[PDB]
């Protein structure tokens, strides 16, 4: 009778990588390189953030006085997400501690079929029978109960180890005629099976990848069905999930944000918080392009000499040498690029699922 089982700690005892981030002379690319008013203001700011995300996906502006080294010391500058060897056993301060105490389900479908078979066979009580059920129950919750003759009281069974929470991946289809901005961190009440939990689901796209790593969506996709990563008790029946938020000002105390089903109980689905840095190419020689307004110190340029440079017209290239102390540098590209294009750094961060709490009332 616990959310975090004691037997879920001994299985993940083999520490694999203990890589440090302070003893590096450059970025970690050694693998392939060298009260209603506040709510209204918050809603308007979230709409602004959503539209900014729509035109500018992961763009961050750098201040001249603030060096990029001390905010970009824990980032990852790997070339491609679908080919590099990601891992799920890293040790980072952003990892939750209770991630140590989660039941790591290897496969979901076969174990789900096995536990359905077990509930079919081992159930000594045949379905469709009259049962006197003498259950332990606390004193104070005797206050909340009403008479059963005017209110429906139902009992729903549970499977093995379902109180022990794990990493959950849900499907997200938006409600019809619905456009409310929802981020990946705000608390949404999710009713799956019968149970209702305050879940903060991290948004992503359910496109398959060879390393089971996907882009962390900061907001819900307005067109395609998204995938939701969180930590929650696992339902082995793949019940549909109703995503809502109770609203007192509305006639109903339910606000339907979306719907979907529980996809997968897999711990390997981690998220890649991406960060894209903008730049304007200043001048163009036939083979060398000198580029302005990326950094503001040359030591940034020698720190980020290994991360590839990409242009949204679809043009990749590498650095050559640091030109000046204002952030200019010379770069070698493949094709001919004009002043209307924008160049960009791409960085990635390992990003972990968060625990969830049950919802009552």
UniProtKB/Swiss-Prot annotation:
Cellular localization per UniProt: Cytoplasm; Nucleus, Nucleolus
UniProt subunit comment: Interacts with RIO2.
The protein's role, per its UniProt record: Required for 40S ribosomal subunit synthesis. Required for normal export of the pre-40S particles from the nucleus to the cytoplasm. Its subcellular location and association with pre-40S subunitshifts from mixed cytoplasm/nucleus to all nuclear in RPS19 disruptions, suggesting it acts after the ribosomal protein.
Family statement drawn from the similarity comment of this UniProt entry: Belongs to the TRAFAC class translation factor GTPase superfamily. Bms1-like GTPase family. TSR1 subfamily.
Further details from the record: Present with 1390 molecules/cell in log phase SD medium.
Name the UniProt record assigns to this protein: Ribosome biogenesis protein TSR1
Gene: TSR1
Complete-protein stretch covered: 346 to 787 of 788
């Amino acid at each position: 009778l616990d959310e975090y089982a004691p037997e879920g700690t001994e299985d993940w005892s083999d520490y694999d990588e203990d890589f440090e981030y302070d003893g590096l002379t450059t970025a970690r690319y050694d693998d392939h390189g060298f009260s209603p008013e506040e709510e209204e203001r918050q809603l308007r700011e979230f709409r602004d953030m959503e539209k900014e995300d729509r035109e500018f996906p992961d763009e961050i502006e750098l201040e001249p006085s603030e060096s990029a080294i001390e905010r970009l010391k824990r980032y990852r500058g790997l070339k491609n997400l679908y080919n590099c060897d990601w891992q799920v056993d890293e040790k980072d301060p952003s990892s939750p501690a209770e991630w140590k105490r989660l039941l790591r389900i290897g496969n979901y479908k076969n174990t789900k079929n096995r536990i359905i078979k077990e509930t079919k066979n081992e159930a000594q009580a045949i379905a469709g029978d009259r049962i006197r059920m003498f259950i332990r129950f606390p004193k104070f919750l005797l206050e909340k109960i009403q008479d059963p003759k005017q209110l429906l009281f139902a009992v729903y069974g549970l499977l093995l180890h379902e109180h022990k929470n794990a990493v959950v991946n849900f499907s997200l289809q938006r409600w019809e005629q619905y456009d409310k901005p929802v981020p990946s961190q705000e608390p949404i009440v999710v009713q799956y099976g019968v149970r209702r939990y305050t879940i903060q689901p991290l948004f992503s796209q359910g496109s398959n990848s060879p390393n089971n790593v996907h882009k962390y969506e900061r907001f819900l996709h307005p067109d395609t069905v998204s995938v939701a990563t969180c930590i929650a008790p696992v339902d082995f029946t793949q019940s549909p999930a109703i995503f809502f938020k109770p609203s007192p000002t509305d006639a109903k105390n339910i606000e339907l944000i979306g719907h979907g089903t529980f996809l997968n109980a897999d711990h390997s689905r981690i998220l890649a918080k991406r960060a894209i840095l903008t730049g304007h190419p200043f001048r163009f020689h036939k083979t060398v392009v000198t580029v302005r307004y990326m950094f503001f110190r040359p030591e940034d340029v020698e720190w980020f000499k290994s991360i590839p440079l990409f242009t949204k017209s679809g043009r990749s290239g590498f650095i050559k040498e640091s030109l000046g102390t204002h952030g200019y540098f010379k770069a070698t590209f493949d094709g001919k690029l004009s002043a209307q294009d924008v160049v960009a750094m791409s960085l990635y961060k390992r990003m972990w699922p968060m625990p969830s709490l049950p919802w009552n009332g």
